[PDB]
Amino acid sequence: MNKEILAVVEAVSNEKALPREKIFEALESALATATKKKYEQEIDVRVQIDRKSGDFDTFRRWLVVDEVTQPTKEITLEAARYEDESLNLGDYVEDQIESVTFDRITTQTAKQVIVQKVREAERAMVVDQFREHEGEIITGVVKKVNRDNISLDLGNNAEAVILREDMLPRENFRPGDRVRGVLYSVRPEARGAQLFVTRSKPEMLIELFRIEVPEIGEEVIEIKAAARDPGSRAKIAVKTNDKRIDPVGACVGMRGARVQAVSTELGGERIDIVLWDDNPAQFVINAMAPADVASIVVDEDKHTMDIAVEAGNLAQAIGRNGQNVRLASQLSGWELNVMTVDDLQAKHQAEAHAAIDTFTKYLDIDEDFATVLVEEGFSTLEELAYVPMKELLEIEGLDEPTVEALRERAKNALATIAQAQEESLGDNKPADDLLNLEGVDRDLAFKLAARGVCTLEDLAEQGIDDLADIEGLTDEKAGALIMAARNICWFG
C-alpha cells in the first residue's frame, strides 16, 4: 500500500529515466480529471500525492483570479485572502473533498497519463539523444501502407511517416519490410507520426555517401552541392582540401563499389560525381559530364550561361527529357542554355546586330562606330549611360567630349524610351497626367492612353461619345471624369 507507491515510483524512475516529480504531477492531474468526471457539475479539482506514503488528498480547487468568469472553478483574490492571507493570483483554494476512490477507472486513467508523460519525457529524451538520427538515415519497419503515405515503426512507440512525394517512383513496400530514410523534419504530432522521413530529397543521397565514404564522415571530403531526379539520376559535387586525395576517386571507390552501393539503395538511380571548382565556368563544365563542352559564355546580369557543344554531343548534353542540363543547372544554381557551336555564333551575331541597330537608332551614330562599341563589349544603352568614364575612354578613337556626348545621348534615349512606354500605357506619364481626374484607376488610365488620351488635357477635350466604348466606363462616369478634367485644366 504505502511502500508500494515508493516501489512503483522507483521502478518507473529507473526504467524510463524520468524525474519522479514529473510522474507525480501527471498522476495528480489524472486523478483531478477522474474526480471532475464523477460530479454532474463542472468543478475545479486539485489532487496532491504525498511523496513518502503515496497517500493523496483531493480538493475543490478555486483558481484565485482578479475577475471571476466561472464561479464554479474561480474565486476572487479578496475572497481567497479571507480564508488564507498568504494566497496570490494564480494559487488554488481547497475544500475537504472525498479522495477519488482508486479502482479500475482511476487506474486506467493513471496508466494513460503515465504513458503520455513517458512519451513527453523518456521518448522525448531518446529523440534528443538520437540528434544524429534526427537528420541521418533512420531505419524503420513498415507498419502500414496507405495510398498517400507509409507508416514506419522505429521502435520504442516512435512512428514515422514517408509521404508519397518523399518515396522513390518505383518503390513498392509491404508491411514488415525494412526501409531506410532521412529524418528531414520533426514536428509536434506525438499522437501519431511526428517524424517525417524522405527517400526522394537530396539529403538522402548526401547521408548515404557520408555512410559509404569514410573520407566524407571524417570531413576530409565535403559535398558542396547535390541535384537529384529521384529514382532516375543524381549529380553530386565534391571538394577536398587534401591535395593527396582524389575526391571523385574516393566517392567512386574500388571499381565503383561505393557509388554502386548508394545506387542500389536508391533503386538503381544513376549517380554522377563531379569535382567542385571555385570558378563557375569550370564547375559547369564538370557538371555537364559526360558531355564535352566546347565553349561557355557567361551572362552575369541574367545569371545565365550559354553552353556550346559539338553537334554530335548536343543530345548527350541535354540528356533524356533535358535531365542532364536540368541537374547541372540545379547543381550550379545557374540557368544553362545548351546549343551547338554554330547556333551560339548565330545567336551572338543576332545580338550584335540588334545592339548595332539599337545604338544606330538611339545614339545617332554610324554603323561603323556602333560596331566598335559592340566589339568593345557594350550591348545595352544602360551600360553606355552608367559605365565608368575610364572604360569608355580606353576605346580607340573616343575622346572625353565624345564620351560625354555618347553618355548624354544614351541617358536621353533611356529617358525617351521610358516616357514613350509610360504614355502608350499607364506606367507613369498617363498614370499621373490622364489619372489626375479623380476616379481614374491605373487600368482606366491605360485604357484611355490606348485611345490616345494620354494627358488630363486630352481627357478634357473628349466627348462622352468618344469614351463610350471603354469597358467599365459608364456615360455618367465618363461625364464626371471629363468634367473633373475640365475643372482642373480650364478653371484651375
Cell numbers 554610324: residue: 366
What x-and-dash track marks residues 202-241 binding another protein by CB under 8 A?
Answer: ----------------------------------------
Which CB atom, from 23 or from 370, has the smaller least distance to another protein? Answer: 23
Q: What count of Cα atoms within 13 Å lies in the side-chain half-sphere of residue 427? A: 9
What nine digits make up the cell of 378? 557594350
State the Cα–Cα distance between residues 354 and 63, nearest whole angstrom: 80
When asked if residue 79 is in the footprint of another protein (CB under 8 A), the reply is yes
Sequential DSSP letters for 60-99: --EEEESS-S-TTTEEEHHHHHHH-TT--TT-EE---B--
When asked if residue 110 is in the footprint of another protein (CB under 8 A), the reply is yes
When asked if residue 54 is in the footprint of another protein (CB under 8 A), the reply is yes
When asked if residue 355 is in the footprint of another protein (CB under 8 A), the reply is no
What nine digits make up the cell of 341? 557551336
Instruction: Find the discontinuities in the chain where C to next N exceeds 2.5 angstroms and give the residue preceding each.
Output: none
Q: Please identify, among the stretches 93-101, 150-158, 362-370, 389-397, the one whose residues bind another protein according to the rule CB under 8 A.
A: 93-101
Which CB atom, from 54 or from 426, has the smaller least distance to another protein? Answer: 54
When asked if residue 98 is in the footprint of another protein (CB under 8 A), the reply is no
Strands 335-340 and 304-309: parallel
What nine digits make up the cell of 383? 551600360
Is 238:247 a contact under the CB 8 Å cutoff? Answer: yes
What x-and-dash track marks residues 7-46 binding another protein by CB under 8 A?
Answer: -x------------------x---x---------------
Strands 149-155 and 158-163: antiparallel
Binding another protein (rule: CB under 8 A), the pick from 25, 56, 260, 385 is 56
Cβ contacts of 207 within 8 Å, gap of 6 or more: 135, 136, 137, 182
When asked if residue 80 is in the footprint of another protein (CB under 8 A), the reply is yes
Which CB atom, from 41 or from 172, has the smaller least distance to another protein? Answer: 41
What nine digits make up the cell of 430? 498617363
Binding another protein (rule: CB under 8 A), the pick from 107, 264, 345, 474 is 107
When asked if residue 139 is in the footprint of another protein (CB under 8 A), the reply is no
Is 160:140 a contact under the CB 8 Å cutoff? Answer: yes
Q: Please identify, among the stretches 107-115, 205-213, 362-370, 455-463, the one whose residues bind another protein according to the rule CB under 8 A.
A: 107-115
Binding interface with another protein (CB under 8 A):
1, 4-5, 8, 27, 31, 49, 54, 56, 68-69, 71-72, 75-76, 78-80, 82-83, 93, 99, 101-104, 106-108, 110-111
